[PDB]
Design an enzyme around this catalytic site. Structure first.
Site, PDB file in Angstrom:
ATOM      1  N   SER A  47     -17.369  32.964 -15.842  1.00 51.32           N
ATOM      2  CA  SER A  47     -16.842  34.265 -16.246  1.00 51.32           C
ATOM      3  C   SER A  47     -17.730  35.041 -17.211  1.00 51.32           C
ATOM      4  O   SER A  47     -17.409  36.193 -17.510  1.00 51.32           O
ATOM      5  CB  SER A  47     -15.429  34.135 -16.828  1.00 51.32           C
ATOM      6  OG  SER A  47     -14.579  33.638 -15.801  1.00 51.32           O
ATOM      7  N   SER A  95      -9.998  37.148 -19.088  1.00 45.97           N
ATOM      8  CA  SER A  95     -10.832  36.615 -18.032  1.00 45.97           C
ATOM      9  C   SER A  95     -10.094  36.646 -16.692  1.00 45.97           C
ATOM     10  O   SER A  95     -10.039  35.645 -15.990  1.00 45.97           O
ATOM     11  CB  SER A  95     -11.298  35.199 -18.358  1.00 45.97           C
ATOM     12  OG  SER A  95     -12.606  34.992 -17.869  1.00 45.97           O
ATOM     13  N   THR A 186     -16.585  33.909 -23.071  1.00 51.16           N
ATOM     14  CA  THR A 186     -16.570  32.524 -22.626  1.00 51.16           C
ATOM     15  C   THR A 186     -16.754  32.411 -21.111  1.00 51.16           C
ATOM     16  O   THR A 186     -16.479  33.361 -20.389  1.00 51.16           O
ATOM     17  CB  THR A 186     -15.224  31.835 -22.949  1.00 51.16           C
ATOM     18  OG1 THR A 186     -14.162  32.748 -22.630  1.00 51.16           O
ATOM     19  CG2 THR A 186     -15.105  31.450 -24.412  1.00 51.16           C
ATOM     20  N   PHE A 188     -16.363  29.042 -17.881  1.00 53.90           N
ATOM     21  CA  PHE A 188     -16.001  27.666 -17.570  1.00 53.90           C
ATOM     22  C   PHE A 188     -15.858  27.535 -16.053  1.00 53.90           C
ATOM     23  O   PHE A 188     -14.973  28.171 -15.482  1.00 53.90           O
ATOM     24  CB  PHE A 188     -14.682  27.341 -18.268  1.00 53.90           C
ATOM     25  CG  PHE A 188     -14.060  26.001 -18.036  1.00 53.90           C
ATOM     26  CD1 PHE A 188     -14.807  24.838 -18.068  1.00 53.90           C
ATOM     27  CD2 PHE A 188     -12.690  25.895 -17.844  1.00 53.90           C
ATOM     28  CE1 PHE A 188     -14.214  23.607 -17.878  1.00 53.90           C
ATOM     29  CE2 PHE A 188     -12.087  24.670 -17.649  1.00 53.90           C
ATOM     30  CZ  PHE A 188     -12.851  23.523 -17.668  1.00 53.90           C
ATOM     31  N   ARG A 230     -17.217  24.398 -26.847  1.00 52.81           N
ATOM     32  CA  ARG A 230     -17.989  25.582 -26.501  1.00 52.81           C
ATOM     33  C   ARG A 230     -18.038  26.601 -27.636  1.00 52.81           C
ATOM     34  O   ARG A 230     -19.004  27.368 -27.732  1.00 52.81           O
ATOM     35  CB  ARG A 230     -17.432  26.228 -25.222  1.00 52.81           C
ATOM     36  CG  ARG A 230     -16.512  27.405 -25.413  1.00 52.81           C
ATOM     37  CD  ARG A 230     -15.212  27.424 -24.681  1.00 52.81           C
ATOM     38  NE  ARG A 230     -15.121  27.919 -23.357  1.00 52.81           N
ATOM     39  CZ  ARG A 230     -14.177  28.468 -22.624  1.00 52.81           C
ATOM     40  NH1 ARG A 230     -12.933  28.742 -22.993  1.00 52.81           N
ATOM     41  NH2 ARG A 230     -14.514  28.791 -21.374  1.00 52.81           N
TER      42      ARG A 230
END
Lengths: 246, 243
Positions: A47, A95, A186, A188, A230
Protein backbone atom coordinates in the site's frame (compact mmCIF):
# COMPACT_ATOMS: atom_id res chain seq x y z
CA UNK A 1 25.97 8.29 -1.60
CA UNK A 2 24.99 5.83 1.13
CA UNK A 3 26.88 4.56 4.17
CA UNK A 4 26.43 1.35 6.16
CA UNK A 5 25.92 1.43 9.91
CA UNK A 6 25.56 -2.22 10.99
CA UNK A 7 25.04 -1.19 14.64
CA UNK A 8 21.51 -0.22 13.60
CA UNK A 9 20.94 -3.99 13.37
CA UNK A 10 20.58 -4.18 17.17
CA UNK A 11 17.00 -2.88 17.02
CA UNK A 12 16.31 -5.56 14.40
CA UNK A 13 18.21 -8.25 16.29
CA UNK A 14 16.61 -7.34 19.63
CA UNK A 15 13.20 -7.97 18.03
CA UNK A 16 14.57 -10.92 16.05
CA UNK A 17 13.71 -9.54 12.61
CA UNK A 18 15.20 -9.28 9.14
CA UNK A 19 14.88 -5.85 7.58
CA UNK A 20 16.35 -2.58 6.42
CA UNK A 21 16.15 1.04 7.47
CA UNK A 22 17.32 3.83 5.17
CA UNK A 23 17.60 7.33 6.68
CA UNK A 24 18.71 10.46 4.81
CA UNK A 25 19.32 13.92 6.33
CA UNK A 26 18.48 16.93 4.12
CA UNK A 27 18.66 15.08 0.79
CA UNK A 28 19.34 11.65 -0.75
CA UNK A 29 23.06 12.47 -1.08
CA UNK A 30 23.43 11.81 2.67
CA UNK A 31 21.84 8.42 3.40
CA UNK A 32 22.72 5.79 5.99
CA UNK A 33 21.44 2.24 6.38
CA UNK A 34 21.90 -0.84 8.54
CA UNK A 35 22.23 -3.12 5.49
CA UNK A 36 23.60 -1.81 2.18
CA UNK A 37 22.53 -4.89 0.20
CA UNK A 38 18.98 -4.95 1.58
CA UNK A 39 18.67 -1.18 1.02
CA UNK A 40 18.81 -1.68 -2.76
CA UNK A 41 16.79 -4.92 -2.78
CA UNK A 42 13.41 -4.51 -4.47
CA UNK A 43 10.14 -5.56 -2.84
CA UNK A 44 6.41 -5.44 -3.56
CA UNK A 45 5.37 -1.93 -2.55
CA UNK A 46 1.98 -3.03 -1.21
CA UNK A 47 0.00 0.00 0.00
CA UNK A 48 2.98 2.38 -0.21
CA UNK A 49 1.97 2.41 -3.90
CA UNK A 50 -1.02 4.58 -2.89
CA UNK A 51 1.42 7.53 -2.97
CA UNK A 52 2.18 7.29 -6.71
CA UNK A 53 -1.34 6.04 -7.49
CA UNK A 54 -2.96 9.09 -5.89
CA UNK A 55 -0.69 11.48 -7.81
CA UNK A 56 -1.38 9.62 -11.06
CA UNK A 57 -5.11 9.65 -10.30
CA UNK A 58 -4.99 13.43 -9.87
CA UNK A 59 -2.78 14.03 -12.93
CA UNK A 60 -5.01 12.03 -15.29
CA UNK A 61 -8.19 13.67 -13.98
CA UNK A 62 -9.54 10.38 -12.56
CA UNK A 63 -9.50 12.03 -9.14
CA UNK A 64 -11.17 15.42 -9.65
CA UNK A 65 -9.51 17.39 -6.86
CA UNK A 66 -8.57 17.41 -3.19
CA UNK A 67 -12.20 17.34 -1.99
CA UNK A 68 -13.57 14.40 -3.99
CA UNK A 69 -15.57 11.91 -1.93
CA UNK A 70 -15.21 8.22 -2.78
CA UNK A 71 -18.72 6.97 -1.99
CA UNK A 72 -19.39 3.45 -0.72
CA UNK A 73 -21.88 1.60 -2.92
CA UNK A 74 -23.14 -0.73 -0.18
CA UNK A 75 -21.38 -3.83 -1.52
CA UNK A 76 -19.30 -5.64 1.09
CA UNK A 77 -15.57 -4.97 1.30
CA UNK A 78 -12.69 -6.92 2.87
CA UNK A 79 -12.42 -4.54 5.83
CA UNK A 80 -15.34 -3.01 7.74
CA UNK A 81 -13.22 0.14 8.11
CA UNK A 82 -13.40 0.51 4.30
CA UNK A 83 -17.22 0.31 4.31
CA UNK A 84 -17.93 4.04 4.26
CA UNK A 85 -17.57 7.18 2.15
CA UNK A 86 -13.95 8.34 2.16
CA UNK A 87 -12.03 11.49 1.23
CA UNK A 88 -8.72 11.10 -0.62
CA UNK A 89 -6.87 11.50 2.67
CA UNK A 90 -9.19 9.01 4.40
CA UNK A 91 -8.77 6.36 1.69
CA UNK A 92 -4.98 6.69 1.81
CA UNK A 93 -4.77 6.69 5.62
CA UNK A 94 -7.12 3.74 6.21
CA UNK A 95 -5.50 2.13 3.17
CA UNK A 96 -8.72 1.44 1.27
CA UNK A 97 -7.60 -0.91 -1.51
CA UNK A 98 -10.90 -1.01 -3.43
CA UNK A 99 -10.83 2.77 -3.90
CA UNK A 100 -7.32 2.59 -5.40
CA UNK A 101 -8.17 -0.47 -7.48
CA UNK A 102 -10.96 1.53 -9.14
CA UNK A 103 -8.59 4.48 -9.68
CA UNK A 104 -6.03 2.11 -11.19
CA UNK A 105 -8.60 0.58 -13.54
CA UNK A 106 -9.66 4.07 -14.70
CA UNK A 107 -6.04 5.17 -15.19
CA UNK A 108 -5.34 2.13 -17.38
CA UNK A 109 -2.11 0.28 -18.16
CA UNK A 110 -0.74 2.62 -20.84
CA UNK A 111 -0.98 5.71 -18.63
CA UNK A 112 0.14 3.85 -15.50
CA UNK A 113 3.22 2.60 -17.38
CA UNK A 114 3.97 6.17 -18.55
CA UNK A 115 3.87 7.71 -15.06
CA UNK A 116 5.95 4.95 -13.45
CA UNK A 117 8.61 5.64 -16.12
CA UNK A 118 8.43 9.37 -15.31
CA UNK A 119 8.71 8.64 -11.58
CA UNK A 120 11.48 6.03 -11.91
CA UNK A 121 9.36 3.80 -9.70
CA UNK A 122 11.27 0.57 -9.05
CA UNK A 123 11.31 -2.09 -11.77
CA UNK A 124 8.18 -0.47 -13.27
CA UNK A 125 6.58 -3.87 -13.84
CA UNK A 126 2.79 -3.57 -13.67
CA UNK A 127 2.03 -6.80 -15.54
CA UNK A 128 -0.53 -9.40 -14.52
CA UNK A 129 -3.64 -7.31 -13.76
CA UNK A 130 -4.00 -3.53 -13.53
CA UNK A 131 -5.76 -3.54 -10.16
CA UNK A 132 -3.40 -5.95 -8.36
CA UNK A 133 0.16 -5.36 -9.58
CA UNK A 134 1.24 -3.64 -6.34
CA UNK A 135 -0.62 -6.08 -4.09
CA UNK A 136 0.40 -9.46 -5.50
CA UNK A 137 1.99 -8.74 -8.87
CA UNK A 138 5.46 -8.17 -10.29
CA UNK A 139 6.08 -4.56 -9.20
CA UNK A 140 9.16 -4.17 -6.98
CA UNK A 141 10.87 -1.16 -5.36
CA UNK A 142 13.80 -0.75 -2.95
CA UNK A 143 14.08 1.37 0.21
CA UNK A 144 16.62 3.61 -1.55
CA UNK A 145 14.24 4.08 -4.49
CA UNK A 146 11.40 4.91 -2.08
CA UNK A 147 13.54 7.65 -0.50
CA UNK A 148 14.46 9.06 -3.93
CA UNK A 149 10.80 9.16 -4.95
CA UNK A 150 9.64 10.76 -1.68
CA UNK A 151 12.43 13.36 -1.88
CA UNK A 152 11.12 14.21 -5.35
CA UNK A 153 7.57 14.61 -4.01
CA UNK A 154 8.81 16.72 -1.09
CA UNK A 155 10.53 19.14 -3.49
CA UNK A 156 7.65 19.08 -6.01
CA UNK A 157 10.02 17.62 -8.60
CA UNK A 158 7.84 14.75 -9.81
CA UNK A 159 6.31 14.98 -13.27
CA UNK A 160 2.98 16.26 -11.97
CA UNK A 161 1.56 19.70 -11.13
CA UNK A 162 2.82 21.22 -7.87
CA UNK A 163 -0.83 21.45 -6.82
CA UNK A 164 -1.35 17.68 -7.10
CA UNK A 165 1.90 16.92 -5.27
CA UNK A 166 0.81 19.28 -2.48
CA UNK A 167 -2.63 17.63 -2.33
CA UNK A 168 -1.08 14.18 -1.84
CA UNK A 169 1.45 15.56 0.67
CA UNK A 170 -1.27 16.87 2.98
CA UNK A 171 -3.03 13.51 2.69
CA UNK A 172 0.11 11.79 4.04
CA UNK A 173 0.37 13.88 7.23
CA UNK A 174 0.29 11.47 10.18
CA UNK A 175 1.82 13.43 13.09
CA UNK A 176 1.73 17.18 13.73
CA UNK A 177 3.32 19.52 16.25
CA UNK A 178 4.42 23.14 15.80
CA UNK A 179 8.02 22.18 14.94
CA UNK A 180 7.59 18.50 14.10
CA UNK A 181 5.62 17.17 11.14
CA UNK A 182 5.56 13.61 9.83
CA UNK A 183 4.43 12.47 6.38
CA UNK A 184 4.19 8.67 6.11
CA UNK A 185 2.55 5.60 4.65
CA UNK A 186 2.49 1.96 5.81
CA UNK A 187 2.43 -1.14 3.61
CA UNK A 188 2.04 -4.88 4.25
CA UNK A 189 1.80 -7.56 1.54
CA UNK A 190 0.49 -10.18 3.96
CA UNK A 191 1.64 -12.56 6.67
CA UNK A 192 3.78 -15.07 4.79
CA UNK A 193 5.15 -18.36 6.07
CA UNK A 194 8.60 -18.65 7.68
CA UNK A 195 10.18 -19.86 4.43
CA UNK A 196 8.23 -17.42 2.23
CA UNK A 197 7.75 -14.34 4.40
CA UNK A 198 5.62 -11.34 3.50
CA UNK A 199 6.98 -7.79 3.45
CA UNK A 200 6.02 -4.86 5.65
CA UNK A 201 6.87 -1.21 4.97
CA UNK A 202 6.97 2.21 6.56
CA UNK A 203 8.10 5.12 4.36
CA UNK A 204 7.95 8.92 4.55
CA UNK A 205 9.75 11.96 5.93
CA UNK A 206 10.07 13.95 9.14
CA UNK A 207 10.40 17.73 9.31
CA UNK A 208 11.96 18.60 12.66
CA UNK A 209 12.67 22.29 13.28
CA UNK A 210 14.34 23.36 10.01
CA UNK A 211 15.72 19.94 9.10
CA UNK A 212 14.19 17.20 6.93
CA UNK A 213 14.81 13.46 7.14
CA UNK A 214 13.68 11.00 4.47
CA UNK A 215 13.13 7.41 5.60
CA UNK A 216 12.17 4.02 4.24
CA UNK A 217 11.86 0.81 6.25
CA UNK A 218 10.97 -2.73 5.24
CA UNK A 219 11.04 -6.11 6.97
CA UNK A 220 10.14 -9.76 6.40
CA UNK A 221 6.92 -10.63 8.24
CA UNK A 222 5.95 -14.23 8.95
CA UNK A 223 3.99 -13.63 12.14
CA UNK A 224 0.93 -11.39 12.41
CA UNK A 225 1.93 -10.01 15.83
CA UNK A 226 5.23 -8.56 14.55
CA UNK A 227 3.47 -5.98 12.34
CA UNK A 228 3.94 -3.07 14.77
CA UNK A 229 7.77 -3.31 14.50
CA UNK A 230 7.47 -1.53 11.13
CA UNK A 231 7.02 1.66 13.19
CA UNK A 232 8.76 0.80 16.47
CA UNK A 233 12.12 -0.11 14.89
CA UNK A 234 12.34 3.06 12.79
CA UNK A 235 11.20 5.15 15.78
CA UNK A 236 13.93 3.76 18.05
CA UNK A 237 16.63 4.26 15.41
CA UNK A 238 15.39 7.81 14.79
CA UNK A 239 15.24 8.36 18.56
CA UNK A 240 18.84 7.20 18.94
CA UNK A 241 19.91 9.71 16.26
CA UNK A 242 18.30 12.53 18.27
CA UNK A 243 15.48 13.23 15.77
CA UNK A 244 12.51 12.55 18.05
CA UNK A 245 12.12 15.32 20.66
CA UNK A 246 15.33 16.49 22.34
CA UNK B 1 -27.07 31.48 11.10
CA UNK B 2 -29.05 30.24 14.09
CA UNK B 3 -28.58 30.83 17.82
CA UNK B 4 -27.87 28.05 20.31
CA UNK B 5 -28.01 29.43 23.85
CA UNK B 6 -27.33 26.06 25.48
CA UNK B 7 -23.74 26.52 24.27
CA UNK B 8 -23.58 29.41 26.77
CA UNK B 9 -23.25 26.79 29.53
CA UNK B 10 -19.64 26.19 28.37
CA UNK B 11 -18.71 29.84 29.08
CA UNK B 12 -20.32 30.26 32.49
CA UNK B 13 -17.99 28.34 34.84
CA UNK B 14 -15.02 30.55 33.91
CA UNK B 15 -17.25 33.60 33.36
CA UNK B 16 -16.08 34.12 29.78
CA UNK B 17 -17.58 36.76 27.53
CA UNK B 18 -17.07 35.46 24.01
CA UNK B 19 -18.61 33.87 20.94
CA UNK B 20 -18.33 30.62 19.03
CA UNK B 21 -19.44 30.26 15.42
CA UNK B 22 -19.65 26.76 13.92
CA UNK B 23 -20.69 25.90 10.36
CA UNK B 24 -21.35 22.41 8.97
CA UNK B 25 -20.48 21.86 5.29
CA UNK B 26 -20.56 25.55 4.30
CA UNK B 27 -21.04 29.08 5.63
CA UNK B 28 -24.77 28.99 4.81
CA UNK B 29 -25.39 26.54 7.67
CA UNK B 30 -23.98 28.25 10.76
CA UNK B 31 -24.87 28.36 14.45
CA UNK B 32 -23.57 30.42 17.38
CA UNK B 33 -24.04 31.05 21.11
CA UNK B 34 -24.45 34.78 20.53
CA UNK B 35 -25.71 36.20 17.23
CA UNK B 36 -24.89 39.76 18.32
CA UNK B 37 -21.22 39.07 19.10
CA UNK B 38 -20.87 36.71 16.09
CA UNK B 39 -20.88 39.72 13.74
CA UNK B 40 -18.89 41.97 16.09
CA UNK B 41 -15.46 42.99 14.78
CA UNK B 42 -12.22 42.54 16.74
CA UNK B 43 -8.46 42.82 16.27
CA UNK B 44 -7.29 39.62 14.57
CA UNK B 45 -3.92 39.44 16.35
CA UNK B 46 -2.02 36.31 15.24
CA UNK B 47 -4.98 34.95 13.24
CA UNK B 48 -3.76 37.53 10.68
CA UNK B 49 -0.78 35.22 9.95
CA UNK B 50 -3.13 33.23 7.67
CA UNK B 51 -3.74 36.09 5.20
CA UNK B 52 -0.23 37.45 5.77
CA UNK B 53 1.28 34.07 4.84
CA UNK B 54 -0.82 33.81 1.67
CA UNK B 55 0.04 37.38 0.66
CA UNK B 56 3.73 36.78 1.41
CA UNK B 57 3.66 33.79 -0.95
CA UNK B 58 1.56 35.56 -3.62
CA UNK B 59 3.91 38.56 -3.78
CA UNK B 60 7.12 36.48 -3.81
CA UNK B 61 8.33 37.86 -0.47
CA UNK B 62 8.13 34.25 0.71
CA UNK B 63 9.86 32.17 -1.98
CA UNK B 64 8.04 28.87 -1.43
CA UNK B 65 6.94 26.40 1.24
CA UNK B 66 10.50 25.43 2.18
CA UNK B 67 11.88 28.91 2.87
CA UNK B 68 13.76 29.10 6.17
CA UNK B 69 13.45 32.26 8.25
CA UNK B 70 16.89 32.44 9.86
CA UNK B 71 17.14 34.03 13.30
CA UNK B 72 19.55 36.96 13.33
CA UNK B 73 20.52 36.24 16.95
CA UNK B 74 18.90 39.41 18.31
CA UNK B 75 16.49 39.46 21.24
CA UNK B 76 12.89 38.49 20.59
CA UNK B 77 9.90 38.80 22.91
CA UNK B 78 9.35 35.04 23.28
CA UNK B 79 12.03 32.36 23.75
CA UNK B 80 10.15 30.03 21.36
CA UNK B 81 10.81 32.54 18.56
CA UNK B 82 14.59 32.65 19.11
CA UNK B 83 15.53 30.06 16.49
CA UNK B 84 15.45 29.48 12.72
CA UNK B 85 11.87 28.66 11.67
CA UNK B 86 10.15 27.23 8.60
CA UNK B 87 6.96 28.90 7.33
CA UNK B 88 4.88 26.29 9.18
CA UNK B 89 7.08 26.73 12.26
CA UNK B 90 6.64 30.50 12.32
CA UNK B 91 2.86 30.26 11.99
CA UNK B 92 2.58 27.47 14.59
CA UNK B 93 4.66 29.21 17.27
CA UNK B 94 3.18 32.55 16.18
CA UNK B 95 6.54 34.22 15.60
CA UNK B 96 5.49 37.88 15.26
CA UNK B 97 8.86 39.30 14.16
CA UNK B 98 8.98 36.98 11.12
CA UNK B 99 5.58 38.24 9.95
CA UNK B 100 6.42 41.84 10.79
CA UNK B 101 9.32 41.72 8.31
CA UNK B 102 7.10 39.91 5.80
CA UNK B 103 4.51 42.71 6.13
CA UNK B 104 7.17 45.39 5.59
CA UNK B 105 8.37 43.71 2.38
CA UNK B 106 4.80 43.28 1.07
CA UNK B 107 4.12 46.95 1.76
CA UNK B 108 0.97 48.98 2.34
CA UNK B 109 -0.21 49.17 -1.30
CA UNK B 110 0.01 45.40 -1.85
CA UNK B 111 -1.37 44.62 1.62
CA UNK B 112 -4.38 46.87 0.98
CA UNK B 113 -5.05 45.22 -2.41
CA UNK B 114 -5.04 41.65 -1.08
CA UNK B 115 -7.25 42.42 1.93
CA UNK B 116 -9.84 43.98 -0.40
CA UNK B 117 -9.61 40.85 -2.55
CA UNK B 118 -10.04 38.62 0.51
CA UNK B 119 -12.84 40.77 1.99
CA UNK B 120 -10.90 40.71 5.25
CA UNK B 121 -12.79 42.59 7.97
CA UNK B 122 -12.88 46.39 7.79
CA UNK B 123 -9.65 46.34 5.75
CA UNK B 124 -8.10 49.09 7.88
CA UNK B 125 -4.34 48.69 7.93
CA UNK B 126 -3.49 52.17 9.25
CA UNK B 127 -1.05 52.85 12.09
CA UNK B 128 2.12 51.26 10.72
CA UNK B 129 2.61 48.37 8.28
CA UNK B 130 4.18 46.04 10.86
CA UNK B 131 1.66 46.47 13.70
CA UNK B 132 -1.80 47.03 12.21
CA UNK B 133 -3.06 43.53 13.10
CA UNK B 134 -1.61 43.68 16.62
CA UNK B 135 -2.16 47.24 17.81
CA UNK B 136 -3.91 49.02 14.95
CA UNK B 137 -7.39 49.57 13.56
CA UNK B 138 -7.80 46.28 11.67
CA UNK B 139 -10.97 44.54 12.86
CA UNK B 140 -12.71 41.29 11.83
CA UNK B 141 -15.71 39.30 13.08
CA UNK B 142 -16.08 35.58 13.78
CA UNK B 143 -18.53 35.30 10.86
CA UNK B 144 -16.01 36.98 8.56
CA UNK B 145 -13.28 34.62 9.81
CA UNK B 146 -15.42 31.56 8.91
CA UNK B 147 -16.24 32.99 5.46
CA UNK B 148 -12.53 33.64 4.81
CA UNK B 149 -11.46 30.18 6.02
CA UNK B 150 -14.14 28.52 3.91
CA UNK B 151 -12.77 30.40 0.89
CA UNK B 152 -9.28 29.12 1.73
CA UNK B 153 -10.56 25.55 2.21
CA UNK B 154 -12.19 25.61 -1.24
CA UNK B 155 -9.18 27.40 -2.82
CA UNK B 156 -11.46 30.30 -3.80
CA UNK B 157 -9.26 33.09 -2.44
CA UNK B 158 -7.71 35.27 -5.14
CA UNK B 159 -4.29 33.62 -4.89
CA UNK B 160 -2.73 30.59 -6.59
CA UNK B 161 -4.07 27.19 -5.54
CA UNK B 162 -0.48 26.16 -4.76
CA UNK B 163 -0.06 29.00 -2.26
CA UNK B 164 -3.41 28.30 -0.63
CA UNK B 165 -2.42 24.63 -0.27
CA UNK B 166 0.97 25.59 1.17
CA UNK B 167 -0.66 27.70 3.90
CA UNK B 168 -3.25 24.98 4.56
CA UNK B 169 -0.62 22.34 5.37
CA UNK B 170 1.08 24.87 7.67
CA UNK B 171 -2.19 25.15 9.65
CA UNK B 172 -2.49 21.41 10.41
CA UNK B 173 -2.70 21.01 14.18
CA UNK B 174 -4.35 17.60 14.73
CA UNK B 175 -4.09 14.56 12.46
CA UNK B 176 -5.71 11.11 12.40
CA UNK B 177 -6.70 8.80 9.52
CA UNK B 178 -10.25 10.22 9.32
CA UNK B 179 -9.84 13.38 11.39
CA UNK B 180 -7.88 16.50 10.50
CA UNK B 181 -7.88 19.90 12.21
CA UNK B 182 -6.59 23.12 10.65
CA UNK B 183 -6.30 25.93 13.19
CA UNK B 184 -4.69 29.15 14.39
CA UNK B 185 -4.70 30.93 17.75
CA UNK B 186 -4.66 34.68 18.40
CA UNK B 187 -3.97 36.76 21.52
CA UNK B 188 -3.81 40.56 21.36
CA UNK B 189 -2.78 41.14 24.99
CA UNK B 190 -4.52 41.69 28.32
CA UNK B 191 -5.58 45.29 27.62
CA UNK B 192 -7.14 46.59 30.84
CA UNK B 193 -10.05 45.55 33.06
CA UNK B 194 -12.22 48.18 31.37
CA UNK B 195 -10.86 47.60 27.85
CA UNK B 196 -9.86 43.95 27.72
CA UNK B 197 -7.76 42.24 25.05
CA UNK B 198 -9.13 39.61 22.68
CA UNK B 199 -8.16 35.96 22.21
CA UNK B 200 -9.06 33.80 19.22
CA UNK B 201 -9.08 30.25 17.94
CA UNK B 202 -10.14 29.82 14.30
CA UNK B 203 -9.99 27.03 11.74
CA UNK B 204 -11.79 23.97 10.45
CA UNK B 205 -12.26 20.32 11.27
CA UNK B 206 -12.59 17.47 8.76
CA UNK B 207 -14.30 14.41 10.23
CA UNK B 208 -14.87 11.53 7.82
CA UNK B 209 -16.44 13.21 4.78
CA UNK B 210 -17.83 16.22 6.63
CA UNK B 211 -16.19 19.61 7.13
CA UNK B 212 -16.87 22.05 9.97
CA UNK B 213 -15.74 25.69 9.88
CA UNK B 214 -15.27 27.45 13.22
CA UNK B 215 -14.33 30.74 14.82
CA UNK B 216 -14.07 31.56 18.51
CA UNK B 217 -13.19 34.80 20.26
CA UNK B 218 -13.32 35.95 23.87
CA UNK B 219 -12.56 38.99 26.01
CA UNK B 220 -9.41 38.43 28.08
CA UNK B 221 -7.75 40.57 30.76
CA UNK B 222 -5.61 37.92 32.42
CA UNK B 223 -3.08 35.64 30.76
CA UNK B 224 -4.04 32.65 32.92
CA UNK B 225 -7.43 32.55 31.15
CA UNK B 226 -5.69 31.94 27.81
CA UNK B 227 -6.29 28.21 27.25
CA UNK B 228 -10.06 28.76 27.39
CA UNK B 229 -9.71 30.06 23.82
CA UNK B 230 -9.32 26.40 22.74
CA UNK B 231 -11.08 24.43 25.50
CA UNK B 232 -14.46 26.23 25.27
CA UNK B 233 -14.77 25.68 21.51
CA UNK B 234 -13.34 22.16 21.87
CA UNK B 235 -15.99 21.32 24.47
CA UNK B 236 -18.79 22.72 22.25
CA UNK B 237 -17.58 20.78 19.20
CA UNK B 238 -17.15 17.53 21.16
CA UNK B 239 -20.73 17.92 22.49
CA UNK B 240 -21.97 18.02 18.89
CA UNK B 241 -20.00 14.85 18.10
CA UNK B 242 -17.09 16.58 16.38
CA UNK B 243 -14.22 14.63 17.89
Amino acid sequence: SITENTSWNKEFSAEAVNGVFVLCKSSSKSCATNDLARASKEYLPASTFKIPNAIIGLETGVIKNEHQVFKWDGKPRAMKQWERDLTLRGAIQVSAVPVFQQIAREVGEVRMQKYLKKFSYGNQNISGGIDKFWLEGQLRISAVNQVEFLESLYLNKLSASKENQLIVKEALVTEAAPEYLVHSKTGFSGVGTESNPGVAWWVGWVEKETEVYFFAFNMDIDNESKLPLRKSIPTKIMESEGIIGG
